[PDB]
Amino acid sequence: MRLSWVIGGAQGTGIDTAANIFGNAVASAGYYIYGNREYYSNIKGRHSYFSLTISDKRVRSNTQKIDILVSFDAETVFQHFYDVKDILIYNKAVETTKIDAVQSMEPELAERIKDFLTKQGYETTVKGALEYASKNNVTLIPVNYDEIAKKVNIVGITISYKLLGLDVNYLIEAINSTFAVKDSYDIVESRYKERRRFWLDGNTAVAIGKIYGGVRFQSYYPITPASDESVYIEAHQDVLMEDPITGDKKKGTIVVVQAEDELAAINMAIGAALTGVRAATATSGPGFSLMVEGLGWAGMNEVPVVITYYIRGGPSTGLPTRTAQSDLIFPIFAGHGEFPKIVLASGDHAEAFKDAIWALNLAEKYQTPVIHLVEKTLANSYSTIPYEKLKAERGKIVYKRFKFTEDGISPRAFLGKATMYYTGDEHNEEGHISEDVVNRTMMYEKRMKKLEVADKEIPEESRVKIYGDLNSLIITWGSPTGVLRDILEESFTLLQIRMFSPFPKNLVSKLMEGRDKIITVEGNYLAQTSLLVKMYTGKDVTNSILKWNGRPFLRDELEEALIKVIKDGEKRVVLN
Amino acid sequence: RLSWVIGGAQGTGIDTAANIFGNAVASAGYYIYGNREYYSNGRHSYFSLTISDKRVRSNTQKIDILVSFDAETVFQHFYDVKDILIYNKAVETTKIELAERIKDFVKGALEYASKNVTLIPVNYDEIAKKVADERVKNIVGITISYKLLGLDVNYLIEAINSTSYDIVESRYRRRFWLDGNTAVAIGKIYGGVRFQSYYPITPASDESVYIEAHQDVLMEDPITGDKKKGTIVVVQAEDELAAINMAIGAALTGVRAATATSGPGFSLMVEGLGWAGMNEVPVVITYYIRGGPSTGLPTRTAQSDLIFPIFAGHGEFPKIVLASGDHAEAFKDAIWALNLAEKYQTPVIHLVEKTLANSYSTIPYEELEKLKAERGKIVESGSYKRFKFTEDGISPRAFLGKATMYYTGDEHNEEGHISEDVVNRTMMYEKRMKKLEVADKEIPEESRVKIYGDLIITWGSPTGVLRDILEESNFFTLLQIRMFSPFPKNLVSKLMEGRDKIITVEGNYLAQTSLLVKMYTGKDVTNSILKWNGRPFLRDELEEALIKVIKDGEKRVVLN
Amino acid sequence: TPQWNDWCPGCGNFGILNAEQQAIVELGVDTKNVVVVSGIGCSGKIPHFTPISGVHTLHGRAIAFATGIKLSNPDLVVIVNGGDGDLLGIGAGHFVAAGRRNVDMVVILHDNGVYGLTKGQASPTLKRGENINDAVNPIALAISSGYTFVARGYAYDVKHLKELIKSAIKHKGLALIDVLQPCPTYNDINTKEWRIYKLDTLPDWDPVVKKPEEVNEKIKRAIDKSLEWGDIPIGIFYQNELVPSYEERIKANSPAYLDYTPAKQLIEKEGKLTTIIDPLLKEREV
Amino acid sequence: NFGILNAEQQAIVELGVDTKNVVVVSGIRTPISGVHTLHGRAIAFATGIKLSNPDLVVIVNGGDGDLLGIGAGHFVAAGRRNVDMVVILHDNDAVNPIALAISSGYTFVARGYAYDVKHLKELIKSAIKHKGLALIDVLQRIYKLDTLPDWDPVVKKPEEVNEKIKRAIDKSLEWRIPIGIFYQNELVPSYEERIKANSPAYLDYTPAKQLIEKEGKLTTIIDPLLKEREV
């Protein structure tokens, strides 16, 4: 049984804590949560909301439709009234407000809600929206947060908690271990452990992944989805390390540097990696575009480095606070001149944690940059994760730094521990500059061979995941995977690509071989995964479900697009 | 077709010597394709040219006549020499990584060449003392080999004056000297570029240096005939980030703006490119492809950068990409690129291999000559919304000073104000992307492709080598792709449809052009001929590898 | 005209915005020619304005954008607004290079102490200890770079700021006004509340170079004054109109430049290219 | 060029630094390791090298256009961190490296002439030894600040900084051409020292020496990181 909750509010007014309190308390009672924050590129005044799904079963997504809307202001009501299906908690003290009254709302939004409501047609007030709600079976609940404010946020979540019918002693704990309920508890009545579980967002899963994985140098430039990853790492930079064969604890430091720009950031991390440290940076689209020169030098000098690339809305500045899946072909082929890159993409919070470690291991084994794609939805979404036996692969460490081999991988010494030469210019086995034609052909080959070796040593089955099984295939990557797995619990084969370079060519050909319908599902315009699939397999997808509006895929909307593809047809469905 | 090489140390008049020879031989009425090969400095360079009756667009590994004044040049080239080998007698007994491999592969080298080459020693040091009381090896030199050709000394005296003979006996339309840089420079000047910004980088500085030298410009009117004096602003930026950003700034003004860079530099311009795409700004980048990755081989060539430039930047946005094949096309494409930039209101990358930049040839006027301007959907004024929703995605374009407008890298509404509205985002993103679809219907597929004979699929400089392979030996259809975005997918697919062999030829390890071909058509190439050593494709070497592909059925031929 | 301003209640930017609008009205400039070029950030969201054109740039790149606009059409009146992170971290290179060039435009720095829009990380003007990095000295760096009109102002003295902005625009060459703007959301220190005095008060304060022999002496006085902080001067620290602007240096070379600017040249007539190529091609005939 | 390089070997020898811990970073021997970086980026690379292994001695060699043109943003940013390393500069308008270095500051700032090589070598020894970020602008009329009445560029008390800055800036406008040390202020802590004060283990077990792995097993312990996240 899955329940949709939404709390809305103006950015800066309480919130966060209201959703993290409610969310903690529902989770402490053994229920599963998937929560997501939607907010403007703004610090105060704009409308933000938190959508949570509540379920008895693990859950991986949110819906357009809402079952419980908690609202303290008037903007929230207008922003959401149309999507509520069951209950709408509102402030009675803002029942009179007109649309024209609301300064915060983007004018383009204000018009649509104005007519809507004029056709239909109700007053174009809050009342008007509330009154629409009633004739679509929504149970209104008036609230007087003013009356309560002087007779003595929390009141809003407490009402909606009572609607569930759970034990008040979790809310309390939830309210005590963080920093009224006597009154608000009794205005409406009820209407509806196993293992360790952790609260994680994508940022924290990656950050913990990097700490555990051996990252001891991290450089970054503040950029919205990824300054939280660093900061978290900086806050826990003093770390303990213990081996079994002595048992001795030894304290270490992760240097975290706030760089002047993204060029500097990548260049410091590359610099760090020559020393033997595991090194990483974190950025988003605008910053990745600046790092490409650095990625080239790292490719050229066979430097391990991981870049965590959070994908936000683009191009350019784009939508700083919103998500997309726009950046696939670009990171795969980023840089002039040809060089091995490994490219990995997580589809959920746990995978975020594990891929970060895997990415470190691959960097070090194939001595090459590794890009780890995480959509910004994963970074700002959070969830109750059960226990999801993981090792280090430092690769071929120990003089010619670029000595030829048949697998392309030269034994690696670190600065201080051997005399070495590095250069961006084409170079011989000693690392000196060499325009010689035979060295050139051989050395360019050797870098390029590393990826053919990765192509063999990484089994194709570890580069994908498979769910369901049927005559109607769906290919995707990243966060919609979660959305589609939740759909499989109620009435196709689901293939999630994980590694795009080296790409699992043959397994994807094989898996497409006997179907009526092949559907790509992804948040972009060009349908970039289909272009990759066609590049490597020669084969075409039959249909696409696409979305580029800055919003993640939602469980109900994607279900209506599947039906509209599968039962009905149409090549190309664009989500609204 | 004859194959001449002069070689020696840099800054030793071997370039002027080559210039003169080539002027002389060309003014007689023959065609030249020349090209220089050099290291990043003292070191050794040589000039290789081919002399022929008809238009010539390539060079050969093998050398008919070799002019040489030191031991180095003999050592470098003796293995490739076929007919004549002019050498200095004073170096006949000189001893020696390239050197290591030559130790088993000067006297000994002539020993080798004899077994079979005519061998011309020269008393260079002696000839020069006889010019006294009356760097002179160079002239004879070019004189010995010129009488070898059996052409009248009158033409070679002409050439010397606008800047021995009998030692040996004789063995054997309006036109322009254009290199790739010069051809682009002159395209841009003619095309209306009034703002070029750049950062110095090996293959591309020469272009901007030519534009600045000719910044004092003169414009007519077809009606009155009234000539007017103009000025091209050329700014040397502080870095490549500044370079594109200045150009983009200038384009908002209404001026045609451009820049020129090479690989390292292009990587730095990716952010600016995204802003231009988001804001629907015409701007062209001349992208000189050189040996990479990273710093790579600054003096060398490649075709390594194709998919990157097509897919550079971190969201989705339209960009047009265009690839020149010879020196004449370089001049045409610079102008086409400007017009495309302005018509579709988007960045255009004009790809030009380093081989074409520094190499030069004798080009016949009928190239051509007919070139027009297209300024696109452009208004004088000035209620106006810059990004007005339109069916073809192309909003009417006003200029700064002529209308109130707002530009931003954030997603925006029709006014250019910031909006995170779900409906606006969907509509506005679609609008930018539509322009590419409109470019695909409106640019005829036959203009984005060049077909010779009637399959080899290629682009850029190897195209000219493959055309020169359509007389010698009884050999194919040659398909040159010219525009990669929007790609001519329907025509390339149709053209791939009725044959046993589809070969791809390009200077890449990955055979990127096959990857692209497969992405848009689903069809695979049967074979591939590749090279990544920083050297152009050569007529002979490529002939022999083509045989391997066709006779022995070799799937992936690598040219070492 | 509708476009909503989402600055936090209390934000020095409301002041910069007001001084800047007023600066232009009073100065009687054709608004048709004003262009405000802004970097990324909170400060980047100006406008927000009166019918002026606005170019919202990339982070750190405003000065490069502004230079292209200005040299293509020198009639425009180009103002740059950027943040401290913008102009002095990621854009510091563009900042130093611009003083070499001396383009006629105004650069207005939003001295915040923080990366506001990205949630408050220390900017390059935050002092160590507030934070593991030192602050740069904007005015001293501008003078060294440098940089032919320099000044500081306070966002909560609109009057004084408006008159700095005006004389910066009137100034022929590259002007810098450094503006101290508090950030109630993220700068707990440097509130307001948090001292300010005006240089213009001092008995004999003369920042203008009259003769070129007094260049070094005026510089040295501006550096001394750039070092006071704690118990803070404000006004015009230095000015020198003897230095030729970049646009004057293009003329001494291309007389026809300022008469026939790149933005006004007609490269086309009825789709027919007007540029004469014939001597360029003639000099290359075989 | 030949002389500047020579003067760097000899200062290293003379201060008795171990050649296996010297890295020379430059833009675009004995057994000294060299890192040829990208154009204008040497300082960012150097910063990364030095902060992972503070036992290394990191010298940055750059051209006038390399640093101070393309690299000018890394130049001023470096002045904010005060990383213990040395920047040797091998010397429209032109900029003043000294003033820009003091204004962005840059806690050791000097000028040498390309020959006197003796004098340069003693400047280089001062820079290395100096605790913090040193810059030497090298020129390729001249006089030595070293030979003036009471020229003392060293700050020794917090109250002297202003007076020392004012004198350095004045001398940097002379063009009589001064060479020598214009300003030295070791009261400003190193970036490494600033890391120490917050993360005290840093110097005695550096990121380069930390064993994050024993025979394939990750030695870091995260349990307390995972406990704070428990439902």
Ligand SMILES: CC/C(O)=C1\SC(CCOP(=O)(O)OP(=O)(O)O)=C(C)N1Cc1cnc(C)nc1N
């Ligand atoms: C639209 C919001 C956004 O994405 C921002 S806002 C922002 C602001 C930096 O602060 P500032 O001191 O220049 O402006 P303030 O907000 O006025 O303090 C950065 C660094 N960014 C991220 C960013 C980082 N690096 C690059 C290259 N581009 C970016 N947009």
Ligand code: SF4
């Ligand atoms: S954050 Fe500081 S700066 Fe950005 S708006 Fe709110 S207050 Fe003004």
Ligand SMILES: [Mg+2]
């Ligand atoms: Mg700021």
